[PDB]
């Protein structure tokens, strides 16, 4: 039911599926425990909206429950991060975790091992800005991450069919903006190569999050723990 959709209908469906922008606790300079507390609390609440977002991603409901679980378990931190990066696009030098939670770079040093991750995220954000990434392009990338990241970790043919559909959708957008044929596939390449770095950041974040668990800096929710346990 997703393959019979036009390019504009694909853009609209994804745009309509966008999760809300959640807020953090509105209040005191951050310690390691408190800063991790807000982040994990925020992510835990975002996760709930991600599931319902994923179900509204065309083709995702067509998959089995196990497949849906596998894709989300694999990609949930990637998805949170590309959202973060996208939100922070209009705030150079800063990371917009929440409208009431803007963190620069020095505040990343409050948590050990975190500042390296901040720098990667800020670099991704600065890259999106340089490319002048459009919202329509962003929602395509995020869903691509959802469907792609776990597909070689297993129905597979259906996912690749939907991935191809999103590719046509991306090209369609670039063709609209006036980009020539050469510029179209060049920009397509540039965008999809960012995901390799988003993957890299997720893996660093996963180990770092797991590190906060081992040191018991902050107690993690059962859901977060389960998403975490699905990795190495």
């Amino acid at each position: 039911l997703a393959l019979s959709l036009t390019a504009d209908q694909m853009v609209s469906a994804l745009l309509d599926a966008e999760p809300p922008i959640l807020y953090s606790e509105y209040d005191r300079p951050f310690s390691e425990a408190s800063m991790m507390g807000l982040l994990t609390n925020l992510a835990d609440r975002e996760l709930v909206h991600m599931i319902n977002w994923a179900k509204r991603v065309p083709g995702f409901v067509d998959l089995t429950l196990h497949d849906q679980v596998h894709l989300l378990e694999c990609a949930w931190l990637e998805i949170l991060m590309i959202g973060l990066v996208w939100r922070s696009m209009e705030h150079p030098g800063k990371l917009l975790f929440a409208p009431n939670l803007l963190l620069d770079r020095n505040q990343g040093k409050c948590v050990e091992g975190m500042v390296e991750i901040f720098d990667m995220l800020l670099a991704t954000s600065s890259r999106f800005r340089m490319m002048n990434l459009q919202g329509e392009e962003f929602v395509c990338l995020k869903s691509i991450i959802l469907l792609n990241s776990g597909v070689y970790t297993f129905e597979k043919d259906h996912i690749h069919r939907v991935l191809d559909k999103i590719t046509d959708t991306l090209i369609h957008l670039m063709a609209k903006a006036g980009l020539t044929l050469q510029q179209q596939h060049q920009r397509l390449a540039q965008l999809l190569l960012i995901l390799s770095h988003i993957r890299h950041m997720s893996n660093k974040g996963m180990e770092h999050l797991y590190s906060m668990k081992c040191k018991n800096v902050v107690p993690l929710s059962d859901l977060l723990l389960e998403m975490l346990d699905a990795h190495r």
């Binding site: 996760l47 599931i51 679980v69 059962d222 389960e226």
Partner: peptide, 10 residues
């Protein structure tokens, strides 16, 4: 017995 199971089916 996954929490993710429940969120996806409702």
């Amino acid at each position: 017995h996954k929490i993710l199971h429940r969120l996806l089916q409702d």
